[PDB]
Amino acid sequence: MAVGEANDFLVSELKVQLEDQFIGTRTINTSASIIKDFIQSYLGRKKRD
Amino acid sequence: ASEAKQTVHTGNTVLLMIKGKPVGRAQSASGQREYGTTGVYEIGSIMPQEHVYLRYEGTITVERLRMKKENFADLGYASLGEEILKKDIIDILVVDNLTKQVIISYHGCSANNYNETWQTNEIVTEEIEFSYLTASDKA
Amino acid sequence: ASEAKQTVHTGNTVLLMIKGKPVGRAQSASGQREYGTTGVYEIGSIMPQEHVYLRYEGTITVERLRMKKENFADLGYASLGEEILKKDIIDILVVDNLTKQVIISYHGCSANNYNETWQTNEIVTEEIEFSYLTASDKA
Amino acid sequence: ASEAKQTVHTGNTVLLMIKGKPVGRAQSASGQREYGTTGVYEIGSIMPQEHVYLRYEGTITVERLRMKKENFADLGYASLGEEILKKDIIDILVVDNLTKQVIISYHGCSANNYNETWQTNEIVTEEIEFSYLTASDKA
Amino acid sequence: ASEAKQTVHTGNTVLLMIKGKPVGRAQSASGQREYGTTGVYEIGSIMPQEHVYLRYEGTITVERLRMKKENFADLGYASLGEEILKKDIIDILVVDNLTKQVIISYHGCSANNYNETWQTNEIVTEEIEFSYLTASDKA
Amino acid sequence: ASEAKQTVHTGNTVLLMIKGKPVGRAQSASGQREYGTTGVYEIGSIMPQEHVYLRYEGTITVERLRMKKENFADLGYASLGEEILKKDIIDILVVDNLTKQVIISYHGCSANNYNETWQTNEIVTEEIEFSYLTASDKA
Amino acid sequence: ASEAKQTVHTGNTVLLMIKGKPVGRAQSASGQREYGTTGVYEIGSIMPQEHVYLRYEGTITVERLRMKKENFADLGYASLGEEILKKDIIDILVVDNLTKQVIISYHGCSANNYNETWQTNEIVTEEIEFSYLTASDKA
Amino acid sequence: ASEAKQTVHTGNTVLLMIKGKPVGRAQSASGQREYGTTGVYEIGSIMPQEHVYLRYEGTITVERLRMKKENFADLGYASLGEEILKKDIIDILVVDNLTKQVIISYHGCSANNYNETWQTNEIVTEEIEFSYLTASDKA
Amino acid sequence: ASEAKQTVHTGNTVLLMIKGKPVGRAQSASGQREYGTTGVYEIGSIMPQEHVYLRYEGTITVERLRMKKENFADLGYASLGEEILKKDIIDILVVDNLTKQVIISYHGCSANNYNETWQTNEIVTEEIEFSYLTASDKA
Amino acid sequence: ASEAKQTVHTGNTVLLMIKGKPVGRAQSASGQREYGTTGVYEIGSIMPQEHVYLRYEGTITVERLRMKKENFADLGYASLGEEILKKDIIDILVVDNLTKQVIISYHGCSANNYNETWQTNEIVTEEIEFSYLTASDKA
Amino acid sequence: ASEAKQTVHTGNTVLLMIKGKPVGRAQSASGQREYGTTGVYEIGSIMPQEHVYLRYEGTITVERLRMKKENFADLGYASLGEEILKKDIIDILVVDNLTKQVIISYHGCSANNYNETWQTNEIVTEEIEFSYLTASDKA
Amino acid sequence: ASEAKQTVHTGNTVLLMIKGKPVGRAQSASGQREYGTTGVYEIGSIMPQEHVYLRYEGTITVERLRMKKENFADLGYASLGEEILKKDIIDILVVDNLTKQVIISYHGCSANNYNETWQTNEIVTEEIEFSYLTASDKA
Amino acid sequence: ASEAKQTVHTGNTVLLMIKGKPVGRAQSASGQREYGTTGVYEIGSIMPQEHVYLRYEGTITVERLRMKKENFADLGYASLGEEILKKDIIDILVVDNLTKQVIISYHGCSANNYNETWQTNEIVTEEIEFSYLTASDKA
């Protein structure tokens, strides 16, 4: 139960931030290399605490 | 000839980028990084026995002309007073201008000082400085 | 670029206003700020985990040709010695020359140091530095 | 055209004056003034709650060629050794050259350092510095 | 970085409260507490078999700038001379600003000692040390 | 800003008085008080049941530059030698020079110790301690 | 070089644990021990005949930044008020974060004193002292 | 400024004298004096009803550079070994230079303790502490 | 002088090699060393009799144009943050371009500070500084 | 200058040894020793007639960095908890490196007290204080 | 101006004389003085009331081309190491070239630092700095 | 100026001797003396009626760099271990190296404590305290 | 005309020499020398009573291109690592180029720092620094 509960929270909050970062689709300058970085920025924060 | 064929970076083949946004018309930027390295010492010897890493210190400084519209203050990415209490972390990236691919990334920047200058015959200029958690690069 | 179209501010299109009076023939001005940012460190990791703000510092410098009249002393916005103790809170604004628009403002200015230059073969300059409670802009 | 019609001071339209005496042929002089301003701080806040004036510090520096006759030392207005025990206060004034009217006054000056320089192809020059009780201006 | 998300309390976020009213211009608050612990020793063995708590001892010190009005003497939380014997037991709380939420509380403080300071050119400051029945936190 | 707005007392505005006479060149003043609070401790509980005030004790120290005339011994206050037996009870006051408003009063001071300090290349300084009966808040 | 070669322990790699849980933002830890050694002295000789161990005593102190959540009182370890009577024996460990290898263990700690420090423009800090029964070397 | 008109004594103007002869190269002189004051406490009231002077206690310390000749041992004001028991009571005075006018006087000093120092590359220095029957000033 | 005959080394005939890789397009490098030499002094003589060595310090600086690939990060001989803690001892050699001969070598290099420069109208430079255990040459 | 010809010992040449094995990364060693000397006083004379040695007292303290392995606890020269009562008396020697030649020796040390320290970003360090039967040197 | 008529001193009409010998081919000289002036401040006023002198400092610098003979070493007015300790008080005078008149004099000169320059493509300069008891002039 | 004119003793010229032998590399020497002066106090008067000398006590400490040969233990003076029982009375002298003139003598020294200090990257130092019977002034 | 007929030294008429060896192709060298002069001060006076020499400090710096063959490192006269333990004293002499006669001598030099620089379009350069016991000159 609790293994799934953490997963559900982690996925919702990842979506909550992507809803700003890239779902805004603000330019065609959004290289995949920045997508990889932003993911690692999210992972770094979840790893830190 | 073409800027993609040289083996070395220069100012005009690089683009400053920020969360969801290209910055542009930046003058310069410098990233300082230190590992606080310290040398272990022994009796019976004058040479250091080894060197140990102790603390990661680092800063990024940014230097830009004051734009007439949607400047740093209006955007708030460097900002003033007790609004700082509600200015979250920023990520700052240095990107190949022709390809839009990352050269390096700074994680977790937040302000350290923010200054400007005015003079009669000159451009209004701004100095910004952030402290950050980690530098990085990947592919 | 054409006069109205310039996408960067300049000394030609900016003028300093203090207590509702323009500071004409200003030589320069510098805004300076520090947030006393400090990093939180731990045993078990080299880097700071997060940074926090502790004490805000604000400062502004102003240079101005010594005016025959309506200098800062005559203005009543600066004074010498035991006259300073009878002078209430001052406010300073940076105003756009073309649009009549506040560019930034400073709240609760008070003098820090105030300095002269009586040189031969040169124009006399007054040099002043203030502290303020906060820096601001509201478009 | 005439020096009286400009709205700004310059070196040659100003005359250095001293008790009962015009000085003349001075190279430069600077008057430093500080109010030791300090910012009160609170818990629950990062901004300073107010700024308070604490101490009036100030100095005047003077810079002149060594005159061949009736120089500073012969006059004694900057002087040497344990004759300083009997050198009373001096008042120093900065005066409009065309009108002989006061621009500012320094009350209560007394020496802080006194230096000279000699070199083969050059004028003998002198540096003097006094500390003073109050700056002032009136009419 | 921002106040809502930092994991460590600072003097910048906390507010100090007394009798349901905030403290003005507190410079510090220290709280020292002892349990007088002692180790149960025996013959036949060198180290203690277990420790026992003997007594509760509480101390708190508050350092404050001397407000022009409504200081501790004017506000009635402290008093000079005869008057302390008339005063009631007083409650002091620590409270985060953003939520007005109690962090800890010193249930029923009472004064021990009172220290004040005046100096040339410089801020007037106070200090009071209290003792308290109990200290506790909830929510 | 002005001395008519600042919320905190400063040594700048504060004057010092003794026997209804103001003190010249007073440097610093310490003010200590104790109410000998003792905790009433119990069998059957570790905490104190209440705190009780028990013996009052205070001390005021005054630091002053040795005046060329009207020092403490030349003025007739605390002095050297046999004359201490005939120095009667004397009161001290702290005042605001801006309005001549009394801050506090030390009722019925008496001398404890007199320190005079001479050091080469330094101003002569003094440091007298006084015991006093009561203190009071007025105005 | 790497943390897998350096010959000396560092706070960088060392982690701290209590009740089988790691401590966040631990700043410093002191560890004292005494074996009350007494010299056995004689008639007929000036030197000691031998040294004997006599009473064991130790102390561990832990310094920590006040967490916004799960501090020592909020986590349920050493706390304030009556609840100390019901805080059972708890063990502390020092670990290498690289391999999770135990460095040392403090068997059966108990609280001695709790210091909490608040200062304006500084991070909130804490300092708890614990007595412990035995310590051990493992791995 | 000048010696005749300053309102504060300095080490620059004062001269120290002993047995009607000046002291050579004195570095400091401190004079500590106590009256042993005590507060008269009662049952039925917490504060003292009045203070009483109990005892006179006098101390003076003089720090001096070790003259090649005519130091305290050579001059007979102090002595090593057996000899102090032969020496008389000695009078020390403070005297302004310009008028040879007594400021204070330590009637009948007598040595307590004597301290000397030698160091590499550095000046040899002395110190003597005396006690005295009475201290007084007139004219 | 002719190419092989030059009796002085130059940047044209020297290239830096690190872990068996040449650092092409190096801008500069500086070697820096201190022996912590200290002199032994005495009473009885002004000069130091002999000098001794106490702590050795070694340092080397390197500047290099930021390479599109095979920069120090990509090389694996430098890295950022928590990547540095996984990187073993590095060795650096200075090698003659014409003879393929070691000019000097450094043992046990570790990074101290490592710095960027992203300027407009300029080539990007990496700026690095290392500590090492020892400096050496063996022809 | 060179090691063979210097006339003064340094921490650079000495090596510290224990039980026939060197000490790793010792930072200091201090040795304090007292003879408890007392002066034989009489009636009829003020100074002592002769001094007498009463007791031998020996102390030595060693400060060391916490080796990852083979520290004092791991190596068996010191121990935590119960174990010190099992350990033997231990010999410590000082020895010049170049000749492996004993300088002094602490015959039969035994532990008194043990002190350890962990800190953020910083080196872990130790300290042990011993007492010893006798100290002697030969050859 | 004509040769005798120049109302300002120059290096062409001034020459340095030391112990009755002219220092020909002097490059430069600087006279430097400080009076250790200090301000007296008070509670009750922001400004210093009066300033006083505490310690006089005198210094003079001299630069001179290294003479094949009759340099300062050969002159016997400077020397190296243990030769300096055998050299009596030196006096220096500044003398007018046209009138043979003392311009200023220095009393009791002694050396402070004394320095060389052996550069290629340049003339060798000796660089010296002295302290003196007093500076003076008597026309 | 020369060592044949200066009026004050300096560690430069002063030599140190023991048992008629000069000490090499002596750093510093302290010399304390007490005459246990007690004030004779009265009923009917607050002041002392007279002061009387009562018990003589002195101490001399000597600081020295550990010589490679002929240190205090290797030379046969104060030493370690049993041999202290057989170290007879020994005298110390202070001398002027210029003329070999005795400054003072410490008659009949005896050892009190011996400190030896070893620190990494520092010279080995020592600090011995001696009690002595009498001292004397000669020449 | 001929270099022997001028009365002044220059770089090309001087030859750097070392034990049994001419150096040659040196760029520059500077010899710093200080006497640590200190001014004795008195009460009753502001002028220093005399100046005393206290310590002889001095250094020689040397600056040379890196030679292709038999350089400083290969010769070892400035050298690296823990070979410094076996590098004896060096004497360095400055000699008339046409006559080979001594101008000055430095006794007892040993290293203090040793540095180099490399750059693309430039010569490899070296900086060396020694500390020495005495400067000197004779005939």
UniProtKB/TrEMBL annotation, chain A:
Superkingdom of the organism of origin: Viruses
Listed name of the protein: Major tail sheath protein
Range within the parent protein: 491 to 539 of 587
UniProtKB/TrEMBL annotation, chains B, C, D, E, F, G, H, I, J, K, L, M:
Protein name: Capsid protein
Pfam family, one: Phi812_tail_tube
Alphabetized InterPro entries for the sequence: Phi812_tail_tube (IPR058640)
Organism of provenance: Staphylococcus phage 812
Top-level lineage group: Viruses
